C-alpha cells in the first residue's frame, strides 16, 4: 500500500500544505486519490477531466522519481484541520482500493 | 502506440476446440491485465474472462468456466484463449482488450477474431 | 451480476443535433468516490472504442464533444455537436465488479 507521509502537518491560514504520497507502481493503470475523512476524493492523479469555471485548491502531481506524489493544498483554511489519507484506485480483476495510514493537518490563526 | 494483433478468421465443426491468439506490442507485456470479449453477430458483449500475465492468475465468467482456457507466452507476449465443446452458439467475433486508467478493463482492443461453429 | 439497461433503444438525429443516451445500471457502480462505468462506440467491422472511464474522464484522443455523467445507478453519455462520423452503436459498461457486463446498446442513426 501507499505511505503519505508526514503523519502530521501544522501551517497557518492561507498557507500552502503539501502531503507526499510514495507509491510503487507496477503500470500506469492506477489512479492515485487523495482523500479526506468525514472517505471524501479530494484530488486524483492523473488529474480528473477540467471543466470551466471549476477550480480547486487540491491538487495530486507526479514527482520525476515516479514513485513519490506530492497532495498539494493552496489557501489552506481553518476548516481544512482533519484527517487525509491516499489510496491507490486499480483492477483486482474487481475496482479495488489500497489504503495509506491516515495523516493530519492542523491549520491554525494568523 | 498500444497494439494488440489477433489470429485470423477460423471455421470449426462442432466439438472442436479453437485456440484464438491475441499478439501484444508497444508495452510492458507483464504489467496489464488481458480480458477476452465476444461478439456474436449483429448481438451484444460478453466477458469470456481476464488474465494477468505477470502470474497467469486467472478469471473466468461462470458462463465459460468449464470450456475456456486463458494462458500467455511471456516469452513472445502473447496471450491465448482456447474455447473447447465448441457449439453452433459460439459463432462470434472474439476480442482481446487491455486495460488502462486503473478502472477500464477494455481501453485497447484487438482487431477481433472471428470463429464459425458449423458442420 | 450487475446488469446494464441502455436507453433509447435507437436515437435519430442530424448532424449538429445533441444526443443524450442513458445507461440504468441494477446496483450502483460506485466505489471509493468514484463511478466505475465506462462508455464506448463501435462501427460495423470494427472493435469498440472507449471514449469514457470512471464514467465522466476521457480516453485518449477523444473529442471534446464526448461527455460522460451520472452517479450511483443513472448514468448519461452526452454528443454536444453530432458530427457525421458519430452515427454508430455506443455501449456502457460497468468495471466496480467482475463479471464486467455491458449494456444491450445505443444505435445513433441518421434522421431525414
Known amino acids: 500500500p501507499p505511505t503519505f507521509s508526514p503523519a502530521l502537518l501544522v501551517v497557518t491560514e492561507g498557507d500552502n500544505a503539501t502531503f507526499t504520497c510514495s507509491f510503487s507502481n507496477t503500470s500506469e493503470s492506477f489512479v492515485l486519490n487523495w482523500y479526506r475523512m468525514s472517505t471524501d476524493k479530494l484530488a486524483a492523479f492523473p488529474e480528473d477531466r477540467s471543466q470551466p469555471g471549476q477550480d480547486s485548491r487540491f491538487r495530486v502531481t507526479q514527482l520525476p522519481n515516479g514513485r513519490d506524489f506530492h497532495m498539494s493544498v493552496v489557501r489552506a483554511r481553518r476548516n481544512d484541520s482533519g484527517t487525509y489519507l491516499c489510496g491507490a484506485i486499480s483492477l483486482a480483476p474487481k475496482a479495488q482500493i489500497k489504503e495509506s495510514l491516515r495523516a493530519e493537518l492542523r491549520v491554525t490563526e494568523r | 502506440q498500444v497494439q494488440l494483433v489477433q489470429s485470423g478468421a477460423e471455421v470449426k465443426k462442432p466439438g472442436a476446440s479453437v485456440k484464438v491468439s491475441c499478439k501484444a506490442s508497444?508495452?510492458?507485456?507483464?504489467?496489464?491485465?488481458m480480458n477476452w470479449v465476444r461478439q456474436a453477430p449483429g448481438q451484444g458483449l460478453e466477458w469470456i474472462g481476464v488474465?494477468?500475465?505477470?502470474?497467469?492468475?486467472?478469471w473466468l465468467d461462470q458462463k465459460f468456466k468449464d470450456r475456456v482456457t486463458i494462458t500467455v507466452d511471456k516469452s513472445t507476449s502473447t496471450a491465448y484463449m482456447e474455447l473447447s465443446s465448441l457449439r453452433s452458439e459460439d459463432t462470434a467475433v472474439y476480442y482481446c482488450?487491455?486495460?488502462?486508467?486503473?478502472?477500464?478493463?477494455?481501453?485497447?482492443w484487438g482487431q477481433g477474431t472471428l470463429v464459425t461453429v458449423s458442420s | 451480476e450487475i446488469v446494464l439497461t441502455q436507453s433509447p433503444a435507437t436515437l435519430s438525429l442530424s448532424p449538429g443535433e445533441r444526443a443524450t443516451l442513458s445507461c440504468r445500471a441494477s446496483?450502483?457502480?460506485?466505489?471509493?468516490?468514484?463511478?466505475?462505468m465506462n462508455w464506448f462506440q463501435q462501427k460495423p467491422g470494427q472493435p469498440p472504442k472507449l471514449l469514457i472511464h470512471?464514467?465522466?474522464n476521457q480516453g485518449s484522443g477523444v473529442p471534446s464533444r464526448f461527455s460522460g455523467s451520472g452517479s450511483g445507478t443513472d448514468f448519461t453519455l452526452t454528443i454536444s455537436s453530432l458530427e457525421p462520423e458519430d452515427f454508430a452503436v455506443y455501449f456502457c459498461?460497468?468495471?466496480?465488479?467482475?463479471?464486467?457486463?455491458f449494456g444491450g446498446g445505443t444505435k445513433v442513426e441518421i434522421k431525414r
Open positions: 482488450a487491455r486495460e488502462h486508467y486503473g478502472t477500464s478493463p477494455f481501453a485497447y
Open positions: 508497444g508495452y510492458s507485456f507483464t504489467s496489464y491485465w
Open positions: 488474465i494477468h500475465p505477470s502470474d497467469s492468475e486467472t
Open positions: 446496483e450502483s457502480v460506485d466505489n471509493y468516490g468514484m463511478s466505475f
Open positions: 470512471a464514467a465522466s
Open positions: 459498461q460497468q468495471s466496480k465488479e467482475v463479471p464486467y457486463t
